[PDB]
Design an enzyme around this catalytic site. Structure first.
Site, PDB file in Angstrom:
ATOM      1  N   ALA A   1       3.765   1.333   6.836  1.00 33.50           N
ATOM      2  CA  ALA A   1       4.399   0.320   6.000  1.00 33.50           C
ATOM      3  C   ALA A   1       5.382   0.920   5.009  1.00 33.50           C
ATOM      4  CB  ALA A   1       3.344  -0.472   5.252  1.00 33.50           C
TER       5      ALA A   1
ATOM      6  N   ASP B   1       0.850   4.296   4.426  1.00 33.54           N
ATOM      7  CA  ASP B   1       1.481   3.504   3.379  1.00 33.54           C
ATOM      8  C   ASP B   1       1.856   4.405   2.203  1.00 33.54           C
ATOM      9  OD1 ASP B   1       2.463   1.274   2.054  1.00 33.54           O
ATOM     10  OD2 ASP B   1       0.500   0.590   1.371  1.00 33.54           O
ATOM     11  N   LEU B   2       2.501   5.524   2.516  1.00 33.50           N
ATOM     12  CA  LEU B   2       2.898   6.499   1.506  1.00 33.50           C
ATOM     13  C   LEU B   2       4.305   6.212   0.990  1.00 33.50           C
ATOM     14  CD1 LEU B   2       1.521   9.696   3.279  1.00 33.50           C
ATOM     15  CD2 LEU B   2       0.514   8.494   1.321  1.00 33.50           C
ATOM     16  N   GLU B   3       4.425   5.987  -0.316  1.00 34.93           N
ATOM     17  CA  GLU B   3       5.709   5.619  -0.909  1.00 34.93           C
ATOM     18  C   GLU B   3       6.179   6.617  -1.956  1.00 34.93           C
ATOM     19  OE1 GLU B   3       4.998   2.569   1.615  1.00 34.93           O
ATOM     20  OE2 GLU B   3       6.928   3.084   0.714  1.00 34.93           O
ATOM     21  N   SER B   4       5.656   7.836  -1.894  1.00 36.72           N
ATOM     22  CA  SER B   4       6.073   8.888  -2.808  1.00 36.72           C
ATOM     23  C   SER B   4       5.833  10.227  -2.136  1.00 36.72           C
ATOM     24  CB  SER B   4       5.301   8.807  -4.127  1.00 36.72           C
ATOM     25  OG  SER B   4       3.937   9.144  -3.946  1.00 36.72           O
TER      26      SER B   4
END
Length: 325
Positions: free
Chosen positions: A158, A113-116
């Site tokens: 995700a 769930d890595l968004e950066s």
């Protein structure tokens, strides 16, 4: 693992919705994504300490849930869980620290769930053969970790839409950046649940722009993974369909769970689900790629178990009953 799942994120923290002890989580959830692993200065050594209970207590609670057939998954992400793998040394710290945690608490898989920190560098143009270290190394680490556990091990992810369906528009920077990750781990991937929220608009394979939180949008976005799609406007660069059983949709459990929009009422979402799963339309603008649907569509993910419990259990009750039906 069931054919129609409800996957719920579990707050290892109090964001105002409170803490729910593992044994008090509604049994309607099939998979519990424990959120999140945390990283320190080196942005690569993942750490985790339970928000309640001794380490032994928490481990025991996980064992209890597993005994009931539930899956308990460690989610890597969050504002305090940024992961940067610029070289082999960082990759190895990542692998070792995660395995240590899986060993320690008995997680039965991991969720990405890595968004950066994830960008396609210049010249990184082939999703089958990525060149950006972060991406190459994440793929390698994920495969390594998954291979370290059996006979089953759950791997989910995700990403936000720009990283996946956004690849339909562009391939570079964040745009399409998870495509090489997905492709690189597709044979290990249990399912992917893109975050269909805090996402604004998305372009479907019909070239039309759709608004998040609408039935058309949900169908249009999921169809891209169910059918495959051309990448970055290149007709000769097609991202292959995943198995239908690898495709889920990530939704907010309540309006407040996605402060920038994305929540969809179960009444409207069931229209989308009936269309996706059974090919039964609802008079929407989007036309599904497969007339008679994708029966093996895997289910729904939600942010989050905690939000759900504060919203009359709307998500869990509505969709469990829908899927059971």
């Amino acid at each position: 693992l069931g054919s129609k799942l409800l996957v719920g994120y579990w707050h290892n923290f109090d964001n105002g919705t409170g803490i729910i002890k593992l044994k008090d989580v509604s049994p309607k959830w099939d998979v519990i994504n424990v959120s999140f692993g945390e990283t320190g200065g080196d942005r690569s050594t993942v750490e985790f300490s339970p928000v309640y209970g001794t380490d032994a207590d928490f481990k025991s609670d996980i064992s209890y849930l597993k005994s009931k057939g539930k899956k308990v998954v460690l989610s890597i992400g969050g504002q305090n869980g940024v992961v940067l793998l610029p070289d082999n040394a960082a990759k190895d710290r990542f692998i070792n620290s995660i395995q240590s945690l899986i060993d320690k608490y008995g997680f039965d898989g991991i969720d990405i769930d890595l968004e950066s920190g994830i960008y396609l560098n210049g010249n990184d143009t082939n999703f089958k053969n990525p060149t950006t270290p972060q991406i190459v190394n994440l793929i390698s680490a994920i495969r390594t970790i998954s291979d370290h556990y059996g006979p089953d091990f759950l791997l989910s992810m995700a990403p936000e839409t720009a990283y996946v369906q956004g690849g339909y528009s562009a391939y570079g920077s964040i745009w399409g950046a998870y495509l090489p990750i997905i492709y690189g781990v597709k044979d290990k991937l249990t399912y992917i649940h893109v975050q269909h929220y805090n996402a604004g608009s998305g372009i479907g394979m019909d070239g039309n722009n759709y608004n998040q939180g609408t039935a058309d949008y949900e169908v249009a976005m999921a169809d891209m993974l169910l059918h495959g799609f051309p990448v970055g406007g290149n007709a000769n660069n097609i991202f292959p369909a995943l198995r239908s059983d690898q495709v889920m949709i990530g939704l907010p459990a309540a309006p407040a769970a996605a402060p920038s929009g994305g929540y969809i009422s179960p009444t409207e979402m069931k229209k989308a689900l009936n269309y996706i799963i059974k090919g039964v339309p609802f008079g929407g603008k989007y036309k599904l790629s497969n007339q008679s649907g994708y029966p093996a569509f895997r289910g729904l993910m939600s942010w989050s178990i905690n939000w759900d419990a504060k919203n009359n259990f709307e998500f869990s009750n509505n969709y469990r009953t829908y899927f059971d039906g």
